[PDB]
Structure 1
Amino acid sequence: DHIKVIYFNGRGRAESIRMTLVAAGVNYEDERISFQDWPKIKPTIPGGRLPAVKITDNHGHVKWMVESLAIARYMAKKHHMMGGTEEEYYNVEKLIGQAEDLEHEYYKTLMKPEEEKQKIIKEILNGKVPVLLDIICESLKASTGKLAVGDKVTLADLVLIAVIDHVTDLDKEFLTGKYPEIHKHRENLLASSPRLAKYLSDRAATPF
């Protein structure tokens, strides 16, 4: 199958999908649409938003997929990255929920002029961000393995590292000297997944 992931030139909502396929060892075309080209591409995209995933089989079937974490969950499930048990499934989802909460704190700072971007950054870093990071640390501590849930890679591992990257975007040193579970998680995840480690080495700094 040809898998084409369509997004803007950034991590954003597409990163969960990219990382899932990378971790699973699945090849895909990573298509990045410039903001200038978006107006003409927009009508060709079912639903008119990105991420969109276009899957073509070798018998001409074209499957369109939207909603990033729905796609990632689908792909993760196909490749046994959503839990081995109902209990592991819950814990995978618990961490995705906690990480998405954090992602939505980070979203408040976006599309805002420098001025109030900084006021909002200070607000969330003094409030909900540390609250959510501790909660994430508690989830990680409760794992029976090296990773988020057990010893094998799940979607929770991937969702977590992408949102931490957004947190460090707001403040490079926010986790420095703190949240030992989150640091230890990223190192165990990179150790367990040479594919992901190489992927992360090869991208390709983006502002979002």
Structure 2
Amino acid sequence: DKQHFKLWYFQFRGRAEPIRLLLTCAGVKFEDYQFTMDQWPTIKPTLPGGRVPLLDVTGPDGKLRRYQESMAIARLLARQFKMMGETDEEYYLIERIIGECEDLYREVYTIFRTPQGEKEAKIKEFKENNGPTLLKLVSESLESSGGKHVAGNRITLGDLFLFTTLTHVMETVPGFLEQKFPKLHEFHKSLPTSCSRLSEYLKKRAKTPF
């Protein structure tokens, strides 16, 4: 007779992962429902908008509210968990990194979705053009705030979304972050020292292609 969180998604990190990391770092238990591709066609017609992620929150009042749009869900939760910045400047810094990372996310997702044949050319394009432009911005943004956290001295949704996005860069363009953007690589290495609940979750997490 209390609260409950149920997250709906595919068996992927993709758009769901920032929400899972947020709930994990906030110390909030939740039902992480990850369904198969085969199960989806019969789940789809039952969900609002026919897309995932969806977060079902059963309130203190026992009532159900179903939330759509991954980073809308994430920002609402982050506000509730005091992980969306404590000043307007911190809020700005968080929004700055998220905007930059949304661009990076799209670049790398496009690569993931490219067939094996045409992938390498999209990768070379990324490494020479939009990749360093975006990654420079992200590096400069993180450097401005001290290199360890996007905003304040504690974990925020900005840190977590930066982390998930860098994971995608590291997997999609192997070695690149490590050679060209070592401070971002270091952020990715060190962030779980600032959320050990994260460290545990990451180690036990199922492996997924994206």
TM-score by length of 2: 0.93
Q: Which amino acid aligns with 2:161?
A: V
Give a deviation string over 1:66-93, Cα, whole Å, max 9, x none. 1000000000110111111001100010
Residues 198, 129 of structure 1: alpha-carbon distance in 2 compared, 3 angstrom cutoff: same
Residues 24-103 of structure 1 correspond to what in structure 2 (within 5 A)?
Answer: 24-57=26-59, 59-103=61-105
* Alignment of 1:19 onto 2:21: yes
Residue 145 of structure 1, CA deviation: 7.0
CA contact (8 A) 1:145 1:151 kept: no
Q: Which residue does 2:153 correspond to in 1?
A: 151
Residues 40, 30 of structure 1: alpha-carbon distance in 2 compared, 3 angstrom cutoff: same
Residue 188 of structure 1, CA deviation: 3.8
The unaligned stretches of length 5 or more in structure 1 are none
Residue 205 of structure 1, CA deviation: 1.1
Select between 19-28 and 53-62 the one with higher mean Cα deviation: 53-62
> Equivalents in 1 of 2:136, 2:64: separation in Å?
43
Q: Which amino acid aligns with 2:176?
A: F
Q: Which residue does 2:192 correspond to in 1?
A: 190
> Equivalents in 2 of 1:153, 1:124: separation in Å?
29
Q: Which amino acid aligns with 1:130?
A: P
CA contact (8 A) 2:56 2:67 kept: yes
Give a deviation string over 1:84-117, Cα, whole Å, max 9, x none. 1001100010001111110011122243321122
* Alignment of 1:116 onto 2:96: no
Give structure 1 regions of 4+ aligned residues with deviation exceeding 6 angstroms.
none
RMSD over aligned CA atoms reads 1.5
> Equivalents in 2 of 1:184, 1:149: separation in Å?
17
> Equivalents in 1 of 2:14, 2:47: separation in Å?
18
The DSSP-based 3-state class of the residue aligned with 2:180 is coil
CA contact (8 A) 1:147 1:188 kept: no
Q: Which amino acid aligns with 2:98?
A: I
Aligned residues: 208
Q: Which amino acid aligns with 1:91?
A: L
TM-score by length of 1: 0.94
CA contact (8 A) 1:148 1:185 kept: no
